[model samples]
Target: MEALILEPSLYTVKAILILDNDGDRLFAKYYDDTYPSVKEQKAFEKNIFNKTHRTDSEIALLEGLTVVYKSSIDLYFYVIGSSYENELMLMAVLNCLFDSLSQMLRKNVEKRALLENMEGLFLAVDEIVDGGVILESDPQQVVHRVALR
Candidate 1:
């Protein structure tokens, strides 16, 4: 496998970060979701798993012993405790991250909306990886201006 570079500038398509227990809160391990195109998304449906079982509301697949799959058509999906203990914990962490992101994108008097344009976008993320945990986000954009005393 090729070593991946941490390219923060790349626009995220479907980012999902699961967290394990950090020292105080939780730490993130796997955090990435950028698709080259919708075709890649289709390919993921076919290749990322062995087979799938369908219910009225879900699609389940077994990805070896490590992970299983659950997805809803046209909506987001997830399968906790499917892979490993660490991955399971990361699922919870992702919930926290997504909630924070959503709030930032909503209407706020503190600042204008975020991730709207190149100049008006702000994102702040910190996570832990294979080696250790670290802060991650674009530093150029400012979410708010504070008057210092």
Candidate 2:
């Protein structure tokens, strides 16, 4: 193995998104400059959702990144990272994010439920992901922070 001079950071996750079954993006947070402008994000979001919505797998390689996604009736939850990043770590974040909302929404993670509880969703996601680093992979940590605030 080749040794590098610098230390790798916890900045592994690139983006997190919650788009509808229609592939219409309603919530998203980017931790990297992969898509600098809003137009690019929408374009990418549309394409990304379309590609994954019909797929059955939990992971994908798109735009040269790792995408771990989940489907809940009317919505799609995604956690993305660099292609070279560990897939499990990204999946953990995805699991945390979804479970956090699952409890927060009282087992209802549907579109209307989420739309109404948008603020809570944002708060919990903030607790789970700080910048590009995954802060908490446990739902309790995220739930504790969300309820406290």
Candidate 3:
């Protein structure tokens, strides 16, 4: 798997792809920031939902699970592995070994010592196919500026 840093180091997001595992068009989205810590991210979970279009229920799930979402956008981390044989999918949520999101959904974080895990974004065969450059432009071909001829 090769990771391409689309933005600068300080930009806080690095996208990558697993070429060997291409069945799901799988790619990895990484979050890089050393100062604020994951705790800081927790505070902005709501903002992250806003940018990422997470449903209120999902937001509440993460909060209830104490899962530190990786990005301000709805992007979470998981691993997508594939081969000539089959495709493997791993959902990138948080876990403390004793409890998982599903398990915690029925329990409590106070009963478990949650640990932060940094894994790449993972989607299933039904999720993606391959990764590529996400190009964007600021100006459109049709200009809207008005001037008297």
Candidate 4:
């Protein structure tokens, strides 16, 4: 008898979000099957942001999904993944984003700095993850890619 092997699905990132202290979304991207509609997506974002507000924890469970986040200065950096995803990996992604932004913006990773360079930030996030797959984890490389754009 031959044995059948089943490989686990790829552990790619699902979403990236940057929210303000007021629970307002600074930037967000969804690479998986997002909410059914824009309204629903907004609601989901609001709920998750509110639930994680003022919390020191780095992880949260929302709508059966796992959200790994880090609060820096006046902004919140978040990486969304499945319940089965690796927590450490998610944290790394968030850190990659933060570090990359800091490097690119001259160590100014705050809300105003990010807003002023939203284009570069968006490019950096794209280099970090796209279509649910992690493309780059090195902060230096991420900044390099975004700098070229």
lDDT of model 2, residue 134 = 74
**Model 3 lDDT-worst window of ten:** 140-149
lDDT of 2 by residue, 66-100 (tens): 88998878888888887653799888889898888
Badly placed stretches (over 4 Å) of model 3 are 1-31, 34-43, 51-149
Write candidate 3's Cα lDDT for 5-118 as tens digits: 344323211222221111121233334332144444433433334433354322222221222223212223222121122211112222211123223233332212112211
Best by lDDT: 2
In model 2, which runs have C-alpha deviations exceeding 4 angstroms?
1-5, 8-10
Residue pairs in steric clash, candidate 4?
none
> Per model, how many backbone clashes are there?
5, 0, 10, 0
The residue pairs in collision within model 3 are: 24-128, 24-129, 25-128, 25-129, 25-130, 52-74, 77-92, 78-120, 78-121, 78-122
**Alpha carbon lDDT at 22, candidate 4:** 76
Could you estimate the TM-score for every candidate? 0.32, 0.90, 0.20, 0.86
User: Model-by-model lDDT, in order?
Assistant: 0.30, 0.83, 0.24, 0.80
Off by over 4 Å in 4: 1-11
List the RMSD of every prediction in angstroms.
Answer: 12.3, 2.1, 20.1, 2.9
